Symmetry: C2
């Protein structure tokens, strides 16, 4: 169902943005 799939997309995007935030913070640590 469409709804469940839409939601899964929204959720994955949201986890992805969280992980990209971490990478940038860790990047800042590196240099």
């Amino acid at each position: 169902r469409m709804k469940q799939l839409e939601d899964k997309v929204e959720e994955l995007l949201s986890k992805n943005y969280h992980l990209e935030n971490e990478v940038a913070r860790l990047k800042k640590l590196v240099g």
Copy 2:
């Protein structure tokens, strides 16, 4: 539509794993 949404989840999923790996590599290295 259904099949494009499935594909997007698959794509986000793949991306998420790559970011996790990346986050794991940078942490090790950094802290």
